[PDB]
Amino acid sequence: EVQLVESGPGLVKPLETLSLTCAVPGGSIRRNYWSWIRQPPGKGLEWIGHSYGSGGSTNYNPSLESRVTLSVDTSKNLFSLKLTSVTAADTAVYYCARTVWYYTSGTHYFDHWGQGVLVTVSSASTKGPSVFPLAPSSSESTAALGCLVKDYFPEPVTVSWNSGSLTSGVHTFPAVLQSSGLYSLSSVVTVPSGTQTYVCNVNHKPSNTKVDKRVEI
Amino acid sequence: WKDADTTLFCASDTHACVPTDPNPQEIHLENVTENFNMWKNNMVEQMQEDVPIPIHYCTPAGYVILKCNDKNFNGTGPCKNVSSVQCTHGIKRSELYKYKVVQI
Amino acid sequence: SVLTQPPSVSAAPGQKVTISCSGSSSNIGRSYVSWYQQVPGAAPKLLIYDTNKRPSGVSDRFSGSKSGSSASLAITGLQTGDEADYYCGAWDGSLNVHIFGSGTKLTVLGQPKASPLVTLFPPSSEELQANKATLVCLISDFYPGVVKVAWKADGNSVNTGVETTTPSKQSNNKYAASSYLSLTSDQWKSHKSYSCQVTHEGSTVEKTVAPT
Ligand SMILES: *[C@@H]1O[C@H](CO)[C@@H](O)[C@H](O)[C@H]1NC(C)=O
Ligand SMILES: [Cl-]
Ligand SMILES: [Cl-]
Ligand SMILES: [Cl-]
């Protein structure tokens, strides 16, 4: 166990600079390579770069090289990352990792990882959602109906139906974050294929907003 | 290359070390004579001060370890048959003094 | 730019599986391969390094290898503890980057595989009143919990304005996922049709809506 603890702001505005810190074991920072790696939610890993603890040796992912600076402060045992001019694509969990590299043998890998920190990139201020019905069209035994909860910030929203009287076949999805900086989700229910009444009840506590929307043909 | 001072990393199979190089290779250098000086070798002193199971000390990229393979050798003097390596042998009080680090 | 892995690998408990990882001679061809195991919401951990070596704590049910420009992770005695996302990785000696694979979700099959039901909602009249148009592709009742979603407008791939959730469990213990194509009303009206195409375990289901 080599303990690495990443830090920084959970939220950064577009076109600002992102700054993160990784705290390390004293008896090792100076005599190892350390990498930053990131992972946008629901997507795969990306290597950002590495830096030897004493060198004099830094290697950046060529595609991010212009925007990236890595530093080692041996005195305060901090490994750091600066990333300039951030966009919606830089929302990710950022991890520091001890790196093993034998350059002459061609082996490069990550043997101890920190726990990660989420950085969300959004210019948004608190905003309640718009709620839109998802009406069933015209196979024919059952139909899906729903509510689209659009363009809110921050999380979370919750949803119920018919004030908690409808729970069977209800599913409420996780939110997505659009490149606008605002979240959306949907809630759906399956019902028999439409003379009776369906209302989604949406709560967004951060804007102190409740919405009831009737979903009709 | 030129005599230089670096912070080496350790390898062993204390957890400040990394696992060993999977393909340690020793490259000889044809012709090539290097002077080793035991009395002024800052790799070797940091090495033994830091000290089954063996521990290897290794250079980061940008540096290399030269090894003396001469049969006369006792730590100091021209070495006539030299190798470059990324790590030392596994150390379990030199020598040890058969090594020095240089910068590429 | 990733080494290629299958999105999903699955088997009943106690079975053996393999996960492929293909690249090229400037990476897997010339470099050692590592493998990482990640439980969602937790950091990856090293599973295999130096192509076929196991760190402490990794059992010999796990073994790695490579042949030319492909690598492979075999797992015997599949079990709950192995359920995770798996990534290969390797240095690229021409580009000088560590390149990771695209990721594979390993599932231990606890229930019948099941194909997705897909429902595509066109934008509501209420949302078009506000000059916006979000298409909502809802995907339900599938197992294992891995899908790929592609959108098209008049038969052409759409890249912009797409967001898709990670599959998660319904109350009946199958999986659901959602995907969105967010347009303006004027963009919505500029095409004759749109489709959401859902790929799951060799199957594709494609639903289509048309403005009007
Ligand atoms: C090292 O070798 C020289 C001959 O090259 C010899 O004179 C000297 O005594 C040796 N040093 C030690 C410490 O044995
Ligand atoms: Cl499979
Ligand atoms: Cl596009
Ligand atoms: Cl119309």
Author numbering:
A (entry chain H): 1 to 52, 52A, 53 to 82, 82A, 82B, 82C, 83 to 100, 100A, ...
B (entry chain G): 45 to 57, 71 to 108, 212 to 252, 480 to 491
C (entry chain L): 2 to 9, 11 to 27, 27A, 27B, 28 to 95, 95A, 95B, 96 to 106, ...
List passages from the publication reporting this PDB structure:
Evidence supports a role of antibody-dependent cellular cytotoxicity (ADCC) toward transitional epitopes in the first and second constant (C1-C2) regions of gp120 (A32-like epitopes) in preventing HIV-1 infection and in vaccine-induced protection. Here, we describe the first successful attempt at isolating the inner domain (ID) of gp120 as an independent molecule that encapsulates the A32-like region within a minimal structural unit of the HIV-1 Env. Our previous structural analysis of complexes formed between A32-like mAbs and the gp120 antigen indicated that A32-like mAbs invariantly recognize the epitope surface around the β1¯, β2¯ strands and the α0 and α1 helices of layers 1 and 2 of the ID of gp120 in its CD4-bound conformation (Acharya et al., 2014, Gohain et al., 2015). On the native trimer of most HIV-1 isolates, this region is buried at the trimer interface and is inaccessible for Ab recognition until the interaction with the target cell receptor and, possibly, the co-receptor (reviewed in Lewis et al., 2015, Veillette et al., 2016).
We developed a stable ID construct of clade A/E isolate 93TH057, which is composed of a gp120 coree sequence with the OD sequence (residues 258–472, HxBc2 numbering) replaced within ID layer 3 by a simple -GG- dipeptide linker. The first design of the independent ID molecule is referred to as ID1. To assess how ID1 is folded, we determined the crystal structure of ID1 in complex with the Fab of JR4, a C1-C2-specific mAb recognizing the A32-C11 mixed epitope within the Cluster A region (Gohain et al., 2015). The structure of Fab JR4-ID1 complex was solved at 1.85 Å with one copy of complex present in the asymmetric unit of the crystal. ID1 preserves well the overall fold of the ID as in the gp120 coree. On the other hand, large portions (38.5%) of the ID1 molecule are disordered in the complex and not resolved in the structure. These include sequences forming the α0 helix in the gp120 coree (residues A58KAHETEVHNVWA70), the first and second -GG- linker (I109SLWDQSLQPCVKLT-GG-SVIKQACPKISFD211 and P253VVSS-GG-GNIKDNW479, including the fourth C119-C205 disulfide of the ID, respectively) and the C-terminal residues (E492PLGI496) of ID1. Overall, the interactive surface that becomes buried due to the JR4 Fab-ID1 interaction encompasses a total of 1,930 Å2 (953 Å2 contributed by ID1 and 977 Å2 by Fab); this is 410 Å2 smaller than the interactive surface buried at JR4 Fab-gp12093TH057 coree interface (BSA of 2,340 Å2 with 1,195 Å2 buried by gp120 coree and 1,145 Å2 by Fab). ID1, the first ID design, consisting of ID as in gp120 corees (Dey et al., 2009, Kwon et al., 2012), failed to adopt the CD4-bound conformation required for formation of CD4i epitopes of A32-like region.
